[PDB]
């Protein structure tokens, strides 16, 4: 027996507070990515990079914010956008009720071990079966073109696509994702945390909020909550293979302006 009582209304307020904060922190929402990807927007159409000639034109006509290998220039671009995503996700984290009242070293640990899992979550919002929106929607790079880059770069995006295909089938919206990303950030099992109970307490409240959100928003998926928790298990391991691959590249191949200052 679900009920509209003060407890539920507080979970809906928490859900709305997180959604609003999500909208401020991440200008390219899933609703907007979906409008661009499905050509259901009046907005300027993205430039498609589907081969080497289309990439060369792309560097010219997609403006972002040298190295003679195409594959390295692409990977570096991904690494710079990842840095930017860490800033926006930290900004988002600050808006989660209880997060800035935690020991700063724990705040750093939560974000240190979480941002990769959130990047792969939010990347899914920008992907379909054909590829991924780049430069906040000015560009679209195809899955197969990324795959065609010489080793070890050809496989850097594949596991994100594998994850995204199955994650996007759950049809989550920005309201669902905002709560989901907050559950990830407040994970009490990160290594090196001083004070666990206060983190689990916020996560408990976030879990209740997420559960209510998915029940209200997804009438034809009675165990979507259990499905989303299963995806946090996936994500941890995807991040394991990502981290392990970034080792190889850094020590087998020859730095963002914020990382200099």
């Amino acid at each position: 027996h679900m009920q509209l009582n003060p407890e539920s209304a507080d979970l809906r307020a928490l859900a709305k507070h997180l959604y609003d904060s999500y909208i401020k922190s991440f200008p390219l929402t899933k609703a907007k990515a979906r409008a661009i990807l499905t050509g259901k927007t009046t907005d300027k159409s993205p430039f498609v990079i589907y081969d080497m000639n289309s990439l060369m034109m792309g560097e010219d006509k997609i403006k972002f914010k040298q190295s003679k290998e195409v594959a390295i220039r692409i990977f570096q671009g991904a690494q710079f956008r990842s840095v930017e995503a860490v800033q926006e996700i930290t900004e988002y984290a600050k808006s989660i009720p209880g997060f800035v009242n935690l020991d700063l070293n724990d705040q750093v640990t939560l974000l240190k071990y979480g941002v990769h899992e959130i990047i792969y979550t939010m990347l899914a919002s920008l992907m379909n079966k054909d590829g991924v929106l780049i430069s906040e929607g000015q560009g679209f790079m195809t899955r197969e073109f990324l795959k065609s880059l010489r080793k070890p770069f050809g496989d850097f995006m594949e596991p994100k696509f594998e994850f995204a295909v199955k994650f996007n089938a759950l049809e989550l919206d920005d309201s669902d994702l905002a709560i989901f990303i907050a559950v990830i950030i407040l994970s009490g099992d990160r290594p090196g945390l001083l004070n666990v109970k206060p983190i689990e307490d916020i996560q408990d409240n976030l879990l209740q909020a997420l559960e209510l959100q998915l029940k209200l928003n997804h009438p034809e998926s009675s165990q979507l909550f259990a499905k989303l928790l299963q995806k946090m298990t996936d994500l941890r391991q995807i991040v394991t293979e990502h981290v392990q691959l970034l080792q190889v590249i850094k020590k087998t191949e020859t730095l963002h302006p914020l990382l200099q200052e």
Binding site: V83, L111, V115, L258, L259
Partner: peptide
């Protein structure tokens, strides 16, 4: 490195 950006962004 990651910590650098997180620490600055949190302030």
């Amino acid at each position: 490195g990651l910590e650098a950006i997180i620490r600055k962004a949190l302030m």
